[PDB]
Amino acid sequence: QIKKLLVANRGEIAIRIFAAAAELDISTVAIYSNEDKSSLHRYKADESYLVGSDLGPAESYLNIERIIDVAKQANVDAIHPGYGFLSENEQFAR
Amino acid sequence: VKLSTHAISFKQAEEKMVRSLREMRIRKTNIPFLINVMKNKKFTSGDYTTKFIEETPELFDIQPSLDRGTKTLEYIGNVTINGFPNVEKRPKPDYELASIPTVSSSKIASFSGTKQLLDEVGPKGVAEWVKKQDDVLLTDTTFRDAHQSLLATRVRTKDMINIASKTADVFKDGFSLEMWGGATFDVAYNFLKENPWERLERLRKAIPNVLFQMLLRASNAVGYKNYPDNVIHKFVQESAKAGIDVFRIFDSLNWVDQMKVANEAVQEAGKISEGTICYTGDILNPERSNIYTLEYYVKLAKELEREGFHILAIKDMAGLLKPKAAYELIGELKSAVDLPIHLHTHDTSGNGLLTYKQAIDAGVDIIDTAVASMSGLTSQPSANSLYYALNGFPRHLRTDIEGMESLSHYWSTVRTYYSDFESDIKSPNTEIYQHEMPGGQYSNLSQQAKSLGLGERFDEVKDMYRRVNFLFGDIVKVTPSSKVVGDMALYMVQNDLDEQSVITDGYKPESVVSFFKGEIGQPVNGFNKDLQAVILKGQEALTARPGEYLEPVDFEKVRELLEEEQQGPVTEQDIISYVLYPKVYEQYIQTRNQYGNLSLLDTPTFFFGMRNGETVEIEIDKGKRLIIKLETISEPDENGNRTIYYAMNGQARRIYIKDENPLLITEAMKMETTI
Amino acid sequence: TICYTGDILNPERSNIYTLEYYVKLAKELEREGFHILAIKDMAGLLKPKAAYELIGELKSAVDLPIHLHTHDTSGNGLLTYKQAIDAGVDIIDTAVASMSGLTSQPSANSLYYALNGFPRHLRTDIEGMESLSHYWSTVRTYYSDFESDIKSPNTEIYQHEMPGGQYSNLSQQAKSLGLGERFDEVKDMYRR
Amino acid sequence: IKDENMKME
Numbered sequence A: 001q002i003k004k005l006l007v008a009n010r011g012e013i014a015i016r017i018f019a020a021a022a023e024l025d026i027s028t029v030a031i032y033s034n035e036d037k038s039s040l041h042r043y044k045a046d047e048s049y050l051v052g053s054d055l056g057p058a059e060s061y062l063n064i065e066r067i068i069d070v071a072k073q074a075n076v077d078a079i080h081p082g083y084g085f086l087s088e089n090e091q092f093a094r
Numbered sequence B: 001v002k003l004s005t006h007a008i009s010f011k012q013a014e015e016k017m018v019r020s021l022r023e024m025r026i027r028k029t030n031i032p033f034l035i036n037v038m039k040n041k042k043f044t045s046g047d048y049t050t051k052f053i054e055e056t057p058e059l060f061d062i063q064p065s066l067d068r069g070t071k072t073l074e075y076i077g078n079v080t081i082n083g084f085p086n087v088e089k090r091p092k093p094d095y096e097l098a099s100i101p102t103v104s105s106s107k108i109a110s111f112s113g114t115k116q117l118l119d120e121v122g123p124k125g126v127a128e129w130v131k132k133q134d135d136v137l138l139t140d141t142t143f144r145d146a147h148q149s150l151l152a153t154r155v156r157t158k159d160m161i162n163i164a165s166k167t168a169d170v171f172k173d174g175f176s177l178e179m180w181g182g183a184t185f186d187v188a189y190n191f192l193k194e195n196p197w198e199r200l201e202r203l204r205k206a207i208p209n210v211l212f213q214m215l216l217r218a219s220n221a222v223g224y225k226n227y228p229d230n231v232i233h234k235f236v237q238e239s240a241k242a243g244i245d246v247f248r249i250f251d252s253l254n255w256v257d258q259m260k261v262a263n264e265a266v267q268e269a270g271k272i273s274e275g276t277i278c279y280t281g282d283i284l285n286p287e288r289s290n291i292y293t294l295e296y297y298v299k300l301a302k303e304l305e306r307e308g309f310h311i312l313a314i315k316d317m318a319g320l321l322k323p324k325a326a327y328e329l330i331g332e333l334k335s336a337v338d339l340p341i342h343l344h345t346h347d348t349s350g351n352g353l354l355t356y357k358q359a360i361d362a363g364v365d366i367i368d369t370a371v372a373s374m375s376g377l378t379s380q381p382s383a384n385s386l387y388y389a390l391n392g393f394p395r396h397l398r399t400d401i402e403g404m405e406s407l408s409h410y411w412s413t414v415r416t417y418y419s420d421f422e423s424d425i426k427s428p429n430t431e432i433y434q435h436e437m438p439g440g441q442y443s444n445l446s447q448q449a450k451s452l453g454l455g456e457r458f459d460e461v462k463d464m465y466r467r468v469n470f471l472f473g474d475i476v477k478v479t480p481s482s483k484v485v486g487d488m489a490l491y492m493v494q495n496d497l498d499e500q501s502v503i504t505d506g507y508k509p510e511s512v513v514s515f516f517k518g519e520i521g522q523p524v525n526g527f528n529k530d531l532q533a534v535i536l537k538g539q540e541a542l543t544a545r546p547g548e549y550l551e552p553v554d555f556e557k558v559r560e561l562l563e564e565e566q567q568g569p570v571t572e573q574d575i576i577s578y579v580l581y582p583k584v585y586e587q588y589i590q591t592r593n594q595y596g597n598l599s600l601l602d603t604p605t606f607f608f609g610m611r612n613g614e615t616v617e618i619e620i621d622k623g624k625r626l627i628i629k630l631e632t633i634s635e636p637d638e639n640g641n642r643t644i645y646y647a648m649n650g651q652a653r654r655i656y657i658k659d660e661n662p663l664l665i666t667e668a669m670k671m672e673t674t675i
Numbered sequence C: 001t002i003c004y005t006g007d008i009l010n011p012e013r014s015n016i017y018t019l020e021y022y023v024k025l026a027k028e029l030e031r032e033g034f035h036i037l038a039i040k041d042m043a044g045l046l047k048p049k050a051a052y053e054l055i056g057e058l059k060s061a062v063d064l065p066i067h068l069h070t071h072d073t074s075g076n077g078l079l080t081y082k083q084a085i086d087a088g089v090d091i092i093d094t095a096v097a098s099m100s101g102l103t104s105q106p107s108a109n110s111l112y113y114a115l116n117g118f119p120r121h122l123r124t125d126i127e128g129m130e131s132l133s134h135y136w137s138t139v140r141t142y143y144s145d146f147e148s149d150i151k152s153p154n155t156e157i158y159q160h161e162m163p164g165g166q167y168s169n170l171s172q173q174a175k176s177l178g179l180g181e182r183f184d185e186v187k188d189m190y191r192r
Numbered sequence D: 001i002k003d004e005n006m007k008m009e
Ligand SMILES: *C(=O)CCCC[C@@H]1SC[C@@H]2NC(=O)N[C@@H]21
Pocket: B078, B079, B082, B083, B084, B085, B190, B191, B192, B193, B591, D007
């Protein structure tokens, strides 16, 4: 039903959702920026992708389409936005 | 340690417990069993007894631990300190980055190459099509024969799969890809310690449009000794199952009888079957041999047609078919038999292109070419150069020239990863036309003559080879037949023999006595009774081909033997591989145990480890990649073990690696002190 | 010596360096009193069939002997010769085998055996040509410090038309200018 | 004066 899930976030909550996602046998895609390449959260997922080398730190977690590419390219069913980045962005959810 | 988890439902407490265990990496414990205890439905039900572990069988059916990076650390560890065999211990050199062409996997799935044709019409339809094409169909040898000749067959799978996409698009109008067999079974499992079946399967997935071709020896397929027919069938079906579709079938003494069993298997499996005449001698020189004449080659083609082969192929394994000889041979063959003709040469005289362009004129249908940067000398003629050479002439070579140049540039840089294994051959050797020494033999045999202290006496070793040929009749110089003529030439120069001398003192060379028993076939000249008698000194000279003196192999017992030894699941490929190459497979498995799948590492890291302060990303495949940074190695401690300070996937790690470099009576300042 | 550039088989390679440009050049050289007309193909650009129609042409138009010279940078230098030999060439330029190939002249030791069966015959001593190669192969190893990086035929010369060792020595300098990786634009600029 | 002081097999 939800084969593979991607978290458009980082750090503590991304690691959190990756844990609940593994518990229900769901593959997890992480996303990371250039400045976040050495983050903990990018090694807790089953796959990992730099959103955009052109995009700069904060933009790499806020570009709606650059993220969604990664999701489609990776065969994603569902995106968990965590809290604070796009978690309340009506247009992203659209 | 102890692990506690909690949730609102016993299942979720159980789910949490499960992943807490896998996430628990201690790099040899109870984890797999305890995980099975969790996924055991009998536990979740919440009702068991003290005899819960004893009652349940497959609790202990644990799946092996993903040791993984800890093993990958061990490998990069062991090579960085103690190097790699046959490679000058040097710090991991700085190669070019060599960006790689790609093509969308959806687009490559849109192509309909010559495998689609085998999947629509049979083999006979593929052959009857090739005939109709006015253009020159090409087979590519870059994945197999070109690097066998030039790089001791060390080219690893990772370098092939990394361009497989572009290759599948560049040779989309090509007849076949030559990629397997020859010497790629043995060198893979043993030297690169990589499984040739995964090379096959992973390429078949990536390249689904073009046919896959291999070089099959009639006597033993890809084996080293002789085998019962039972195993010739097993191997042929399984390669056929895994993607091989064009089986080139040759015999080292052009003896059709040994080619029949390897033939019934390829017909049975329903793929294409190339009957091959190996070319020796000189069709233009009447005084060179009275056996290998244009009549012989036309006869064998008719023989090869009657025996039911789908394409007739010609194998110039020593570059002895001259340009004019090509013109007559093929044209005379083309009009006597009605199969397409698949010509294969080695560019050792530097006339390989001249053979081909002549051959194309006589109307050859398929030719063996390698990409430019991996072409010439003991390899195939350059596909690139050839494409432009037919500019202005009527015939055209059906290929993607701009795609080949990109394939050349990639292979040019990649090959420098393999410069440790380059052949010593820098130039065409036109005097193959006399001694008929096969590809990479007039160099390999020179290094062996040096061993015996004959290194500067090579004129008498070259001449002896040519004399030895005539001595055993007129035979075909190809493995293993080339080895006996080789071993036989050293021996007579080793202790000063000649033709009549070796018969006259004969009763007073392991391969040679194996040869005269017929253990490799029956020569087209027979044997010299007086010569024969003295070499083997009286044992059973085989009265027919070697296979029929051999009892069929019980593949069910082999499956039992391997399953007791290994974890459990032994596939058919595991089986026939152990049968064909016992020691190497056994050894390959032990290596697979210690270090995991090394066919995933980049070729430099495979060969040199890493240098201090460098980071390395490994495609664990499809989105999963692990990143390793070497910080420092320590000096050897009290023993011979060094501490490599690693950084993998962000988590600091360390590995300890073995470095290879009264009572007592001591001395301190020239003073014999005793304890 | 006519210096050969471009391609005489492609009608839209050039509007100038065409077959009749070389014919016109050759007669002028005859009218200027050179005893031998030699074609200096300094880049391996004279494809096999192009050699058959360039040579067969001038062989009639000028009454000089024809001296051909080429570099096997494409891997088709021998084919270029065997064509001109069948189109009435008088003298070719060759190197001993072990000192041949790539940006050197075509292999003499090979072309001798290449012509086995065809009308003409290379006037030389193979038995002696073999020994000269066995010598020169060794002496060559004292010069390993100076061998080019070219190790295989490069067909892309048919585009940029760089001569003996200019797609070698250029990439050398191109890297020393912040453009070695982007050498696809140099091989397009140099072409342009 | 006398002084008193690749991977393949
Ligand atoms: C030295 O013996 C250690 C090298 C590590 C093993 C590797 S795996 C591939 C090579 N084949 C082999 O037998 N050893 C090498």
